[PDB]
Design a protein around this ligand. Structure first.
Ligand SMILES: O=C(Cc1ccc(-c2ccc(OCCN3CCN(C(=O)CC4CC4)CC3)cc2)cn1)NCc1ccccc1
Ligand SMILES: Nc1nc2c(ncn2[C@@H]2O[C@H](COP(=O)(O)OP(=O)(O)OP(=O)(O)O)[C@@H](O)[C@H]2O)c(=O)[nH]1
Ligand SMILES: Nc1nc2c(ncn2[C@@H]2O[C@H](COP(=O)(O)OP(=O)(O)O)[C@@H](O)[C@H]2O)c(=O)[nH]1
Ligand SMILES: [Ca+2]
Ligand SMILES: [Ca+2]
Ligand SMILES: [Mg+2]
Ligand SMILES: [Mg+2]
Lengths: 440, 61, 425
């Protein structure tokens, strides 16, 4: 009951899904052949980990997932990789040509050729569910697939599953670690197209992840693997309430109730601690107070913005590991008395706390250190609108000259779609401005 | 309760309608672009036919 | 992921033969087609340019075209000659005599179908074709006229496939033939319209490099083709070797061409060292040096719309990021500000043969204007006096067709100027 189907779209989505499912397996004690000696319920069960894993009669635990990319390079690595055994081949779907960083190809030209099959496979996954709860969609803003095909899939899922929850984990483009200069265009387009079909979206700025990997892990030049492992840790913290369950656990929907004051204001800012190397972690046990403090240092945020220059509409803390309410409340009191936590006048200032007891694990030989406790803060703040502004600026610089626009028009699009998406983005920016104004 | 159902159904219907319209419009636009480009190349072949025809009207002189 | 190679004419066939020599060396393929390399990374993307023939042979997906038979016999005679498809040699007898009309309209028109049949066969065995590349020259007749035409017919039959060209620019410094400006303008008229990317290989830039920087008072065509082969190996490096970049020609073209007409690139290579007598900062400047450019243009006389830099060799990629950011910020005035993050940079950890590390440079700069204005100048010097027009009107062409090509090229130059003068506000 209460199952969740993960959909990983494009290169970024697929590789992040690899990280996430490997980490889930390590967390639940599932082997790469799908076996779990812990589970004595053969063939099924209502356990918490079954929200993300189905079971076969042979004892295999299969991710409730489907990976989709318009070209086979990335998913072929999964098919031949260490966890090739976990997935039924039908869960891994590939086209032949990709979207070439073009939203039009992902949404219209190439996406239409494979959308029906993807929906059929998603339906096959959903038909196994006794009470499906929603979808988790992993994708990048910048890629032609991750933008266009993700948008098309979200529209179609809205059609075929009604208002059933669809959460997003979206990769916000870094200005200097990207393959494409047209990523502002795709970002604006897909944000416009999916805004009505997403109930909650967690943006991850690759620049923030890159800076965190460099500063906290002393990695000269982080790779996609480093960023993806950190992102997997964040996703695991967010989904642990779904996959584990205990006395103090708070279910992600309960946080979602607080985090979304209006349908359009559904972009939480995620912060994660501790991110620390093995070398620095030795003889440096980190207390609840210390990681909670780190949660409010902006250098640990998933998106580069300044919360202190905006206003909070919600603040949730998701602890996992050796944590008890006494220490959490003490740390929160110190932070309240020593930081700039300015709430909008129309919502309460309390902090919503959940704690999972299962400690965080780490990929063997990874750069992140194993720790006894960790925390992820999910805050609804106006400051995240900066991430929009920045992007909306880059867009504006190119579209004034129609730079690269011919590549989209050539694939069937009209300038009207560009203008409509940009106007929607401007309305979103002013909505974020408005929510922060004080009442009369 | 019936209003809730009506709004869910309305959302689904208009999602479907707008997506169908978008895909139809995109198909029409891409088809027109290709067609224009194909006819341009054909007119180019034509100019080529004309000039090659012309070459035969000067040698007979 | 398969590309189909077409070389047309003397220059095209010769520099294409050298290109195949170089990349076969890099991929560990011998003149017979067998693989004897010591790295499986040499073959992960071998199908990009080779078919796997029965008996574990490797054969270039290449297509040799000419209205003269001498270049095919020479190509077979030279190194790796026996590796090409013997049925892919499409030949003629009558030649074109440095006449654009004879290559485009009359004789090349007779041979074009013969060439297209071979192209069709090669294409129909591709699991997923990504596009074509053409090596040819603009000053000749066959490579010029027949390549432009063959490009148009391929676009007819493959309208949604990438067409790139390595086009060699005529220069008085290397070729005596006067009428080359006519052929260059006529072929540019076509290229502006039917290609996705044209890498302007300038013979004036090549001779200037070979003389002033390589110390060759007399360089042979082989000396220039050494540079050209190095450049072509660099430009194709990303597609030929595994890395952390998932890009076919359509992705790279999307990132490099902001306006359909302005797709004429300024290649660059470093290091350029003579046989008589290297750090990432030095590679980086040398690569941005106006005197490492393969087009006779000064980038500091224009502004970059987009730039791509491919480094080859084991190096500190942190240092690469540092030096590229450095050049960008210390030369900000030469990068248009309405295209944020318009400089992309790739690293391949395997150098080319003979060097510990090289730096290939692709640039979409409005300074290419200088090259196009050069040609145009020569063009008008004849057309205002209608010199040699009988060579072309004899084949059926009209005089206003020359005028259209001249005005189209002038329009292209005026367009490069427009976006060079544009500002954000
Ligand atoms: O376009 C051509 C010639 C050509 C044009 C452009 C490019 C190109 C090069 C770099 C680039 O971005 C660099 C990618 N970033 C990606 C991830 N990075 C990380 O650090 C990963 C880790 C997390 C931090 C940084 C790097 C984009 C494009 C290459 N080549 N085509 C070839 C051709 C022409 C004509 C005929 C045949 C073939
Ligand atoms: N964090 C992270 N981001 C990635 C990764 N791979 C790609 N991206 C993001 O995606 C953008 C580039 O587009 P891709 O994801 O590579 O392309 P795609 O989604 O597969 O769709 P195509 O453009 O058609 O290839 C960049 O802006 C990156 O931020 C990854 O492995 N990890
Ligand atoms: N770089 C280079 N250019 C060449 C070579 N051979 C001919 N060219 C150029 O091409 C022009 C003549 O074209 P050509 O190669 O004869 O093709 P064709 O006339 O159609 O057969 C001249 O302007 C030369 O600069 C060569 O081996 N290398
Ligand atoms: Ca169970
Ligand atoms: Ca000579
Ligand atoms: Mg991809
Ligand atoms: Mg010749």
């Amino acid at each position: 009951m209460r199952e969740c189907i993960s959909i990983h779209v494009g290169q970024a989505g697929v590789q992040i899904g690899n990280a996430c499912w490997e980490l889930y397996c390590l967390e639940h004690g599932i082997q790469p052949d799908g076996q779990m000696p812990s589970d004595k319920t053969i063939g099924g069960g209502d356990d918490s980990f079954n929200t993300f894993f189905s079971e076969t009669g042979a004892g295999k635990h299969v991710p409730r997932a489907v990976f989709v990319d318009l070209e086979p390079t990335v998913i072929d690595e999964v098919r031949t990789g260490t966890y090739r055994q976990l997935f039924h081949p039908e869960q891994l779907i590939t086209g032949k040509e990709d979207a070439a960083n073009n939203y039009a190809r992902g949404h219209y030209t190439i996406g239409k050729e494979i959308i029906d099959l993807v929906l059929d496979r998603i339906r096959k996954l959903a038909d196994q569910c006794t009470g499906l709860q929603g979808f988790l969609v992993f994708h990048s803003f910048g890629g032609g697939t991750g933008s266009g095909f993700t948008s098309l899939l979200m529209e179609r899922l809205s059609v075929d599953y009604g208002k059933k929850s669809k959460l997003e984990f979206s990769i916000y483009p870094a200005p200097q670690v990207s393959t494409a200069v047209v990523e502002p265009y795709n970002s604006i387009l897909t944000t416009h197209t999916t805004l009505e079909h997403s109930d909650c979206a967690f943006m991850v700025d690759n620049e923030a992840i890159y800076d965190i990997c460099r500063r906290n892990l002393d990695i000269e030049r982080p790779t996609y693997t480093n960023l993806n492992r950190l992102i997997s840790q964040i996703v695991s913290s967010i989904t642990a309430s779904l996959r584990f369950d205990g006395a103090l656990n708070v279910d992600l929907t309960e946080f979602q109730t607080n985090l979304v004051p209006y349908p359009r204001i559904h972009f939480p800012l995620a912060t994660y601690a501790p991110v620390i190397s093995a070398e620095k972690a030795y003889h440096e046990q980190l207390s609840v107070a210390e990681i909670t403090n780190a949660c409010f240092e902006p250098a640990n945020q998933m998106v580069k913005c300044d919360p202190r220059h905006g206003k909070y509409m919600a603040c949730c803390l998701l602890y996992r590991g050796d944590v008890v309410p006494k220490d959490v409340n003490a740390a929160i009191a110190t932070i309240k008395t020593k930081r700039s936590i300015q709430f909008v006048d129309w919502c309460p200032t309390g902090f919503k706390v959940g704690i999972n007891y299962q400690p965080p694990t780490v990929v063997p030989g990874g750069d992140l250190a194993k720790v006894q406790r960790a925390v992820c803060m999910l805050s609804n703040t106006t400051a995240i609108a900066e991430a929009w502004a920045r992007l909306d600026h880059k867009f504006d610089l190119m579209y004034a000259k129609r730079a690269f626009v011919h590549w989209y028009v050539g694939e069937g699009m009209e300038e009207g779609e560009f203008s409509e998406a940009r106007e929607d983005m401007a309305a979103l920016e002013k909505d974020y401005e408005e929510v922060g104004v004080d009442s009369v | 309760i019936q209003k809730a159902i009506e709004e869910n159904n309305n959302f689904i219907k208009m999602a479907k309608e707008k997506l169908a319209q978008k895909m139809e419009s995109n198909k029409e636009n891409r088809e027109a672009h290709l067609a224009a480009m194909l006819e341009r190349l054909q007119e180019k072949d034509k100019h080529a036919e004309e000039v090659r025809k012309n070459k035969e009207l000067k040698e007979e002189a | 992921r398969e590309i189909v190679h077409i070389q047309a004419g003397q220059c095209g066939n010769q520099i294409g033969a050298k290109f195949w020599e170089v990349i076969s060396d890099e991929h560990g393929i011998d003149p017979t087609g067998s693989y004897h390399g010591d790295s499986d990374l040499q073959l992960e993307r071998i199908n990009v340019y080779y078919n796997e023939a029965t008996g574990n042979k490797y054969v270039p997906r290449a297509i040799l075209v000419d209205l003269e038979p001498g270049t095919m016999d020479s190509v077979r005679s030279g190194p790796f000659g026996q590796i090409f498809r013997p049925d892919n040699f499409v030949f003629g007898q009558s030649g074109a005599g440095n006449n654009w009309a004879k290559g485009h309209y009359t004789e090349g028109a007779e041979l074009v179908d013969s060439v297209l049949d071979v192209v069709r066969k090669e294409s129909e065995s591709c699991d997923c074709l990504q596009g074509f590349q053409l090596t040819h020259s603009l000053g000749g007749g066959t490579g010029s006229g027949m390549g432009t035409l063959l490009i148009s017919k391929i676009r007819e039959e493959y309208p949604d496939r990438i067409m790139n060209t390595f086009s060699v620019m005529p220069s008085p410094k290397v070729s005596d033939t006067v009428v080359e400006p006519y052929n260059a303008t006529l072929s540019v008229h076509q290229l502006v319209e039917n290609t996705d990317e044209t890498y302007c290989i300038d013979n004036e830039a090549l001779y200037d490099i070979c003389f002033r920087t390589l110390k060759l008072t007399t360089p042979t065509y082989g000396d220039l083709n050494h540079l050209v082969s190095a450049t072509m190996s660099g430009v194709t490096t990303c597609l030929r070797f595994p890395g952390q970049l998932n890009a076919d020609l359509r992705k790279l073209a999307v990132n490099m061409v902001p306006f359909p007409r302005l797709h004429f690139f300024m290649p660059g290579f470093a290091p350029l060292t003579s046989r008589g007598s290297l750090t990432v900062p030095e590679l980086t400047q040398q690569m941005f040096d106006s005197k490492n450019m393969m087009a006779a243009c000064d980038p500091r006389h224009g502004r970059y719309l987009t730039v791509a830099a491919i480094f080859r060799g084991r190096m500190s990629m942190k240092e690469v990021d540092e030096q590229m950011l450095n050049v960008q910020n210390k030369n900000s005035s030469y990068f248009v500000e309405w295209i944020p993050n318009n400089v992309k940079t790739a690293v391949c950890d395997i150098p080319p043969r003979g060097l510990k590390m090289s730096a290939t440079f692709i640039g979409n700069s409005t300074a290419i204007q200088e090259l196009f204005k050069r040609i145009s100048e020569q063009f008008t010097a004849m057309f205002r006096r209608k010199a040699f027009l009988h060579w072309y009107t004899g084949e059926g062409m009209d005089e206003m067709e020359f005028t259209e090509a001249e005005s189209n090229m002038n329009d292209l130059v005026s367009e490069y100027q427009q976006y060079q003068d544009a500002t954000a506000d």
